[PDB]
């Protein structure tokens, strides 16, 4: 009778009596519940918690009838909750999961290509990497037989992509920088005349310029045209400040005002001419600024001069405590992004922005307030390049440090292993691929070229490729480098053969790859030498860590690819050797904490003609 008029909330139950009174009950629920006048419910706020937060607190929003979850976020895959209801909401909760296109097998990387896991916060989360045998950019992949990094053929990756998908100027031979000067579709590395000048360039004097008059005034046997010092005697051609004068024929090799004899840093750029200690050796090129120091003697080729060299490193990260952004806690890198003197791995806040690393959405990059505004679990500002050095995640080596973003050999130290008067055959490095392939030339006593970049966790893998058949000894590269006497090496002989010095302990060097680590009491010298070739166990200089045990030795001509894996933070090591495609030896996994990570850099003991090509180093902590 009176629920005729509709007096009650629309949806509510109205209840008439035979009196023409009534009576409202319900609420539809999803509303709050007076009877008459009834309003909505806010599932969300101040009831559970059915939405996944993204680290922040905003996910669930409230609607007029009823509620609704939000998609889960990028980086995440799941189900999206929508309930109209108060008991709808207790029940029923959204799942999101991390993504992984790899793990998910989601990706649209080559059957002949590998998913990377870039990390979860990485942008982007994955990337596609032809295999080993293999080149192009990922989607699609062609036979690479020489390993470096350029395919036999161009493949339909030509226009879209910039390296890799172009095919290999020379197919046999390693040479990852494709250099072709004269531009014939013939490379330098395999090119019997590198200008088409028609002097074959064994007997030219200017390899890499037209001149086939030959016109050499001074006969340092380098031509005229491509003679930085026409006049002077300079077969190297060293031309420290690069700008096509010799060091020779220059008053100011470095370019900095301060003329030669003048220049307390003759090979480096300084018009300050600070000299803090007065050496005469200026702070810029003085390996032991605060201490005395002239003739600057570095025994263990550590870049710390004998004077200030105490070798009292606690943490073993190479990094003398006097000198050690965190003494004692492991950081061979040193990374300390804010520059406040307190290094990242030993620092709560390494940008300095007030939230500590733990709970920063850009832990490297400036940002008090974290702005997200994509939900992505990252802070927008560090959008594409975590670390804020200009070259993106997907492009650098070291995503996580502003210091690093390509691999770079082209400065290098050369680090002797038994130095002395003559008999002294120092090796030869060519460099190439602007320093991701380096050449080694002579047959010379045993000697590493390191480069500067430091790692702690860290995969550097590389092109193996000895180019002539002359001779059965020892190439490979070191890591973990922090003096001469510490060290990781991995090396490979040819044919078994025992070291021609009998003194001061006889040294049998077998065939096979192998991993050593360098604690050594005495340095550089004989005893190290004869150490490093033996393979096995030399008290107070090497332990060999792990050799293949089949001996197997590398063949001439032969292509092989290297892949290192260190984790020092537990001493993880491993060691891939592949031939073309198929795996030819594999440490496993190998455990070693001598050293808590260092540098990286290329190892001879007499072996000429070898190549080490398209070079990889990348951080895999960092
Ligand atoms: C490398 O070896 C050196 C010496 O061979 C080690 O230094 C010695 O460590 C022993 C512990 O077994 C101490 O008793 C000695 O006092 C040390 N010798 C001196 C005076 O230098 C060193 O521990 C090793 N370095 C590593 C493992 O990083
Ligand atoms: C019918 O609806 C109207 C709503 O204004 C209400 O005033 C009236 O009381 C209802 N029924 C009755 C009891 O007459
Ligand atoms: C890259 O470009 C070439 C151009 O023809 C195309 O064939 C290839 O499929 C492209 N890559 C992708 C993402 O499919
Ligand atoms: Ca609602
Ligand atoms: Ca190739
Ligand atoms: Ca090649
Ligand atoms: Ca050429
Ligand atoms: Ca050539
Ligand atoms: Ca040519
Ligand atoms: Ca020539
Ligand atoms: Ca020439
Ligand atoms: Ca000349
Ligand atoms: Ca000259
Ligand atoms: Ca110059
Ligand atoms: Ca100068
Ligand atoms: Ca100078
Ligand atoms: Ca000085
Ligand atoms: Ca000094
Ligand atoms: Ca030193
Ligand atoms: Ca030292
Ligand atoms: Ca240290
Ligand atoms: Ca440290
Ligand atoms: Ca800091
Ligand atoms: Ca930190
Ligand atoms: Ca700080
Ligand atoms: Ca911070
Ligand atoms: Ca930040
Ligand atoms: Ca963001
Ligand atoms: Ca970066
Ligand atoms: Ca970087
Ligand atoms: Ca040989
Ligand atoms: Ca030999
Ligand atoms: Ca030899």
Known sequence: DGCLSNPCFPGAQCSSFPDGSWSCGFCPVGFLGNGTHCEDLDECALVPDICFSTSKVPRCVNTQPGFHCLPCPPRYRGNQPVGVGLE?????????????????????????????????????????????????????????????????????????????????????????????????????????????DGVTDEKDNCQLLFNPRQADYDKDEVGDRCDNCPYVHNPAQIDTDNNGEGDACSVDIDGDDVFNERD????????????????????????????????????????????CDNNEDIDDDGHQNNQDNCPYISNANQADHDRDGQGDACDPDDDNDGVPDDRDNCRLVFNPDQEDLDGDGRGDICKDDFDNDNIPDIDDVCPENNAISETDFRNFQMVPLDPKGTTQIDPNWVIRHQGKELVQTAN???????????????????????????????????????????????????????????????????????????????????????????????????????????????????????HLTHRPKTGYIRVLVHEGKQVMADSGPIYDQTYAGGRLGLFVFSQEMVYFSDLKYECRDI
């Open 444 to 562: 010379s006593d045993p000697g590493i070229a390191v480069g500067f970049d430091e790692f702690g966790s860290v995969d550097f893998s590389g092109t193996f490729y000895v180019n002539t058949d002359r001779d059965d000894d020892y190439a490979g590269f070191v890591f973990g480098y922090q003096s001469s006497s510490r060290f990781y090496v991995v090396m490979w002989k040819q044919v078994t053969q025992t070291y021609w010095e009998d003194q001061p302990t006889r040294a049998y060097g077998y065939s096979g790859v192998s991993l050593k680590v360098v604690n050594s009491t005495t340095g550089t010298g004989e005893h190290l030498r004869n150490a490093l070739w033996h393979t096995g166990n030399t008290p107070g200089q090497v332990r060999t860590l792990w050799h293949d045990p089949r001996n197997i030795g590398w063949k001439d001509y032969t292509a092989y690819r290297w």
């Open 88 to 196: 709808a909401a207790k029940t029923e909760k959204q799942v999101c999961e991390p993504e992984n296109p790899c793990k998910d097998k989601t990706h649209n990387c080559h059957k002949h290509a590998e998913c990377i896991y870039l990390g979860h916060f990485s942008d982007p989360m994955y990337k596609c990497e032809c295999q080993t045998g293999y080149a192009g950019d990922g989607l699609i992949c062609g036979e690479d037989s020489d390993l470096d990094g350029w395919p036999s053929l161009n493949l339909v990756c030509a226009t879209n992509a910039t390296y890799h998908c172009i095919k290999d100027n020379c197919p046999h031979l390693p040479n990852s920088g494709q250099e072709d000067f004269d531009k014939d579709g013939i490379g330098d590395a395999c090119d019997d005349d590198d200008d088409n």
């Open 264 to 307: 307390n840093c003759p090979y480096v750029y300084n018009t300050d001419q600070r000299d803090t200690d007065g050496d005469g050796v200026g702070d810029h090129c003085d390996n032991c600024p605060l201490v005395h120091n002239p003739d600057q003697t570095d025994v263990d080729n550590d870049l710390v001069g004998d004077q």
